[PDB]
């Protein structure tokens, strides 16, 4: 737009390395690029979670027969869902501005990545959500906790607890805030708490990588491996579409940009995932 009724010609400035513009965003609350994707056709998904297990065998038998009981798992159902994000843009505005079209695309990719991430972690098994991570992690274990323990020691400890389940876990998934305060805590005998060294680290605990997700919340650490724990079966793959013939594009010169995918979410893990909460 070349109007002067609001917008100025000090927001429509030409780019070619001269009268340069910003347009830059920050990426947080991710889990999708680590995660595996496979195709699948299907109208719903069926996942299993393990319940508490009653025994039909107890070591008080050596001449007394069996006992009725169930080994129970419960099933959750997820119907095919659509995740997408929209940008509505003025063509004239895009062309004049010059990086605005590039950025609107990357911006829509950032919003699709976030909307995935919210449903996938949050709440328990749901039919209006891709819910997994929160349900699957096991609680905080108090034995691990001690009076005047190190923040770093806890993260080391957590990782051993995950091995007990027989699962793949090869990295730590933390909150951005918790990790940074956790890293900053240096012993009074002058050793770093994550790894006992006096050098810069890129952030390593247990000789394992840090993946920073901002959906995990403060005082929380969750060790896991995304690839084992979840899987994304794909009804339809990403394709961007733009329609200017739609209701709203017509009203005044505009184009609507839609960026979408259609997914189902599979959880190959009945309880595989574990977490502990910081008390340092």
């Amino acid at each position: 737009m070349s109007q002067l009724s609001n917008q100025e010609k000090e927001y429509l400035i030409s780019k070619a390395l001269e009268t340069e513009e910003g347009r830059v965003a920050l990426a947080q609350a991710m889990a999708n690029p680590i995660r595996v994707s496979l195709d699948y056709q299907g109208v719903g998904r069926k996942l299993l979670v393990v319940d508490p297990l009653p025994q039909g065998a107890l070591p008080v038998y050596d001449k007394d027969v069996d006992a009725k009981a169930f080994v129970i798992s419960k099933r959750g159902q997820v119907p095919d869902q659509v995740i997408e994000g929209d940008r509505i843009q003025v063509p004239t505005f895009e062309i004049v501005s010059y990086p605005q079209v590039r950025f609107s695309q990357v911006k829509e990719r950032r919003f699709n990545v976030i909307d995935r991430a919210q449903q996938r972690a949050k709440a328990d098994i749901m039919a209006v959500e891709d819910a997994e991570i929160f349900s699957l992690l096991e609680g905080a274990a108090t034995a691990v906790n001690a009076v005047t323990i190190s923040s770093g020691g806890l993260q080391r400890a957590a990782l051993t607890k995950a091995f007990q389940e027989v699962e793949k876990h090869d990295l730590v998934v933390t909150k951005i805030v918790m990790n940074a305060s956790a890293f900053a805590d240096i012993r009074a005998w002058g050793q770093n708490e994550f790894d006992p060294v006096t050098q810069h680290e890129v952030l390593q605990t247990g000789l394992f990588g840090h993946i920073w997700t901002a959906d995990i919340l403060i005082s929380k650490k969750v060790p896991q491996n995304t690839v084992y724990v979840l899987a994304d079966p794909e009804f339809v793959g990403v394709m961007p579409i733009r329609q200017d013939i739609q209701v709203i594009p017509a009203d005044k010169p505009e184009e609507l940009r839609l960026g979408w995918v259609i997914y189902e979410e599979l959880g190959l893990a009945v309880v595989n995932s574990l977490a502990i909460a910081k008390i340092s």
């Binding site: 979670v49 508490p52 419960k74 959750g76 328990d124 098994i125 749901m126 039919a127 959500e129 349900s135």
Partner: protein, 150 residues
Amino acid sequence: PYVRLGYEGILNGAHDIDVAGLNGVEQLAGKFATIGANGVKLAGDNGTNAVGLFREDLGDMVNASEKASFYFRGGEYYVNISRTSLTAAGIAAGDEITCDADGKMIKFTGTGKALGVVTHVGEYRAGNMYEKATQGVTDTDTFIGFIMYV
């Protein structure tokens, strides 16, 4: 159970103090509601009556129908004291549910002068009989949130 006495119940609300047991005698202290069969998932999905009949699967949690929909309950029937002014339907897990033995008023939903069943969902429904059974003599209101004697 196997009886219904309506016309505004034997007494108002979802509580009965002139009745006390019917099959066996009352339960002492309530239990936590967990969907499923008392999973590690606590909210969303299907199950939990919002004042209905309960079964128990673990000896400290109570849960509700998952298997059998439009067919009455199998084993175990448990009315509720309190939880006053909650119409049955949807889910209602993650609450503490106070349980007494059958002989107290619970909350129904569905049509009047018809016999009703239990859905896996946590709702009740009703209609003319081609696959509905159980409950005594009809006397149900068309207005939902009715005080059903079980």
